[PDB]
Design a protein around this ligand. Structure first.
Ligand SMILES: [Zn+2]
Ligand SMILES: [Zn+2]
Ligand SMILES: [Zn+2]
Length: 572
């Protein structure tokens, strides 16, 4: 019960017993916390509570020291000192921002802004408080019991009364009862389990609420700048392919951490795997939050890096299918590809953390705690989608507030920027360049003349809260008949309920804007569905239209984004 202060690093026995994370607060900070918040319980070796029998005075301001013990104003002896006096709380070794992180419910945007504008220890305290609050909210949801089993991918459920029912989408992973993790998609619902088990009636599903471990290491290590490349040994025969990134790989060896903003199709995976060919002796650990991002880096490594020094680290609780071409769990290989929550405690010459807009400060901290590296590279784009903040309902989270790396890329600018998009038809590049990249993204491709936009509001129906626009899918059906080349298109929309109606009516493979991130397709059909804050989000809009390599059809609901699309307008 003895440690350092989460606000000034001063030594103390004092911890706030009212905080969901029990932080150590020094005498001056602990006082300035209990006197300006509803939090009045202070802990140390023993709690500051009235020692008198059957007494329930736990407020530190209403307590005193009578000998080696604590009592209130109604039980204390004549020789008693108040615990709260002269701006200090009595303890061994004798804040506005901390107060707000300790007392917020994490439902407002300003809560997340503060958790990123504060000092580094307050960023870790906010990351811990938030993740603990997010897990205690998963308990509030009601247990889902199987009522009947229709087929191999279809069923009907019985929900717990009183306790709210969580939204059925692949974004929420249940745990059957330990009959494997299971996911759902909306009376004929779709059942998709990580494990093959003959669906039983009576067996129930609960969201796996994991325990939040304390955060020790910072979100970003202190920056160091070097005059020479440190601990890394470059080649003077880096292939013509990676020559465009030589000036940037050198910047990587001359700084502790480096930020890289890579708009869609500008060469992020190419840069990441190219850093290994530039310092061919270095041990590189490739990390990302999702299994999909770690697998997309594995695919690029399979093409250039020797498959013998490559290892895909798969966690024992293998949830959904990942990369199978590398030696599994060989922690000691030169190239280690592994998701953040599966990272073993190891060291590296370079750590590459990809899809940095999806990282939370909790993830940023975990990577710094599990990996000790000479150099750290953060690759991503604050103009793309962040990690879902499940408690956030009021206000929108701006990219400078996604995490500490994003905050740097949006305030001081990124260290490195890949400015030429080699995937998208010029119409898409020119639209996203003006929308989110302040006209600095350039098109390598020509205009494809296969980019269309249609202003059709349709009719919005709601499957609980996930939206459907059957008339916008009707327009896509009409278009598909006159444009058979578009038969091979991927259907994208901001809602999975729209994607379910579109999969049955169009037969096109379906993907939400959020699951499309990181992937590319020749043709993309996007229906906006609604003109809500969710479907008008410019980061979602940017990810949606930048998936196409050849053509895109956008059926729009919002006049603003329809007008901003530099596409050929269509009629019907
Ligand atoms: Zn302090
Ligand atoms: Zn507190
Ligand atoms: Zn008392």
């Amino acid at each position: 019960a003895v440690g350092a202060c989460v606000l000034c690093n001063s030594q103390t026995s004092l911890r706030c017993g009212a905080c969901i994370r029990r932080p150590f607060l020094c005498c001056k900070c602990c006082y300035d916390h209990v006197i300006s918040t509803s939090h009045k319980l202070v802990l140390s070796v023993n709690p500051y509570v009235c020692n008198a029998p059957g007494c329930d005075v736990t407020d530190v301001t209403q307590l005193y020291l009578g000998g080696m013990s604590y009592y209130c104003k109604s039980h204390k002896p004549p020789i008693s000192f108040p615990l709260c006096a002269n701006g200090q709380v009595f303890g061994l070794y004798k804040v506005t921002d901390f107060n707000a992180i300790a007392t917020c419910d994490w439902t407002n945007a300003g809560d997340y802004i503060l958790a990123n504008t504060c000092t580094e220890r307050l960023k870790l305290f906010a990351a811990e408080t938030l993740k603990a609050t997010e897990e205690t909210f998963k308990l509030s949801y009601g247990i889902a019991t199987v009522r009947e089993v229709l087929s191999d991918r279809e069923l009907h459920l019985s929900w717990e009364v009183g306790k709210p029912r969580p939204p059925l989408n692949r974004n929420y992973v249940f745990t059957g009862y330990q009959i494997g993790e299971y996911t759902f998609e909306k009376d004929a619902v779709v059942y998709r389990g990580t494990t093959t088990y003959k669906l039983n009636v009576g067996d129930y599903f609960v969201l796996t609420s994991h325990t939040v471990m304390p955060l020790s290491a910072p979100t970003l290590v202190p920056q160091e700048h070097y005059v020479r490349i440190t601990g890394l040994y470059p080649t003077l025969n880096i292939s013509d392919e990676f020559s465009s990134n030589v000036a940037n790989y050198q910047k990587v060896g001359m700084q502790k951490y480096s930020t890289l903003q890579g708009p869609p199709g500008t060469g992020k995976s190419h840069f990441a795997i190219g850093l290994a060919l530039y310092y061919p002796s270095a041990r590189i650990v490739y990390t990302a939050c999702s299994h999909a991002a770690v697998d997309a880096l594995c695919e690029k490594a399979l093409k250039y890096l020797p498959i013998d020094k490559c290892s895909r680290i798969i966690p024992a609780r293998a949830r959904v299918e990942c990369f199978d071409k590398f030696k599994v769990n060989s922690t000691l290989e030169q190239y280690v590809f592994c998701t953040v929550n599966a990272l073993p405690e190891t060291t590296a010459d370079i750590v590459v953390f990809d899809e940095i807009s999806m990282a939370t400060n909790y993830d940023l901290s975990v990577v710094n705690a599990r990996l000790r590296a000479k150099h750290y590279v953060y690759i991503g784009d604050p103009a793309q989608l962040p990690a879902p903040r499940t408690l956030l309902t009021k206000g929108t989270l701006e990219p400078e507030y996604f995490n500490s790396v994003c905050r740097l890329m949006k305030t001081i600018g990124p260290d490195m920027f890949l400015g030429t998009c080699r995937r998208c038809p010029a119409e898409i590049v020119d639209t996203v360049s003006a929308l989110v990249y302040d006209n600095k993204l350039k098109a390598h491709k020509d205009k494809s003349a296969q980019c269309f936009k249609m202003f059709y509001k349709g009719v919005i129906t709601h499957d609980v809260s996930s939206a459907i626009n059957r008339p916008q899918i009707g327009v896509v059906r009409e278009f598909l008949t006159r444009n058979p080349a578009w038969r091979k298109a991927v259907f994208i929309s901001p809602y999975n309920s729209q994607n379910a109606v579109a999969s049955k009516i169009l037969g096109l493979p379906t993907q939400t804007v959020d699951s499309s991130q990181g992937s590319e397709y020749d043709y993309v059909i996007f229906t906006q569905t609604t003109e809500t804050a969710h479907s008008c989000n410019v980061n979602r809009f940017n990810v949606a239209i930048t998936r196409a390599k050849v053509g895109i059809l956008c059926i729009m609901s919002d006049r603003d984004l329809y007008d901003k699309l530099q596409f050929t307008s269509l009629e019907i």
